Ligand binder design. Structure first.
Ligand code: NA
Lengths: 224, 218
């Protein structure tokens, strides 16, 4: 039965955060439902939603398209991943600011088409008249972390990346209040299905276990 | 003043980064270029002079290449916290305990690869898991295991990734392992590569690993 299927797209690195918990609870509440999961970048999720290849997309930025709509789930703090012997690691307990990083070799990611996660990272530098002088782009966050640990530079990464711990890799807090990164759930620009409204309530439940406080105008409910 | 090193991505969770870092610090005049690539690509790149050393998990013999086994890394089973296999002591389980589970193999790139190696270890003992799905890379398998979708066989160094309600269970079969090799051109005798060998030896000595006679020495 094609009607009893829900297909979900997601950026791969979100598996380091709350997404697996959400999927686990969703499956527990829906043993009847065939749930299919597809890794894809935020840009690619738009075309997949428009074409009906997926029904909801977990992404890391807003890319405006009239066929799609979205809800901001939350913002994650950014950390600076450094080698433990880097001078910046002496500020591990308290943190650093974006302006401390301008002359460092920074590893951006992913390498998938623009805009992507790295676009916002470069924007927050520009927003404050900061011009990083040494940038390299790598394939994905786990490669960036391994390179940092090998001595290749530093990288700005979501806080949930701390699920990965490597010898002599250290995560330093980034103190600028706008040094954060968004998580969105995107769907077709139409009324959500029963199954998608059910996914929204699963997210609400997981976020409540995590102690987050939701605004009034957050995830929409079904109306008459 | 430039050495080029190729490596399979999974090795970033183990000792390779600290090896490269110690090597880097001992050679301030040398440029280190690191390239993520599979074993097939490493072999051809070595032959053509595009990389100088390759780190991988597969040894197919080639007359133009010399490979040295660094160590055998243990395999483990990634399972969800409440899984019955996660109830079986601080001892472990055997491969034959896994045959009726949904197993997540990876990567989905061209073979030979880690999935064919895993399936070979099963077939080596007349075990034929029927509930198999192939995914892109290790993080996808782990995330799906944490989501409750199945189990996955992974290298021990994968424990660098820790996810909510994901547990790693030891395997008891002696051949439940995955090797790590360094590959160079069979001709090779560069001082920079001999020094790379020295660095591997130092770190392994500190870990207390590999002590066969003339291992990377001459
Ligand atoms: Na289900």
């Amino acid at each position: 039965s094609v009607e009893k299927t829900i297909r979900i797209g997601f950026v791969g690195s979100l598996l380091f955060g709350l997404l697996p918990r959400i999927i686990h609870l969703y499956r527990q509440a829906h043993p009847n439902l065939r749930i299919e999961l597809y890794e894809m970048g935020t840009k690619a999720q738009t075309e997949a939603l428009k074409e009906g290849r997926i029904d909801a997309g977990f992404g890391r930025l807003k890319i405006s398209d009239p066929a799609i709509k979205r809800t901001l789930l939350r913002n994650e703090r950014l950390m600076v991943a450094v080698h433990a012997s880097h001078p910046l690691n002496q500020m591990k307990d308290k943190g650093v600011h974006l302006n401390d990083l301008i002359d460092e070799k920074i590893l951006l990611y992913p390498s998938s088409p623009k805009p992507n996660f790295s676009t916002h990272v470069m924007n927050i530098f520009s927003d404050h008249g900061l011009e990083p002088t040494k940038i390299n782009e790598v394939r994905e966050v786990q490669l960036a972390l391994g390179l940092v640990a090998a001595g290749e530079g530093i990288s700005l990464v979501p806080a949930s990346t701390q699920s990965i711990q490597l010898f002599n890799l250290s995560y330093v807090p980034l103190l600028d209040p706008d040094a954060i990164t968004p998580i969105y759930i995107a769907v077709r620009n139409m009324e959500e299905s029963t199954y998608i409204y059910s996914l929204y309530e699963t997210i609400r439940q997981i976020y409540a276990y995590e102690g987050f406080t939701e605004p009034p105008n957050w995830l929409e409910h079904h109306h008459h």
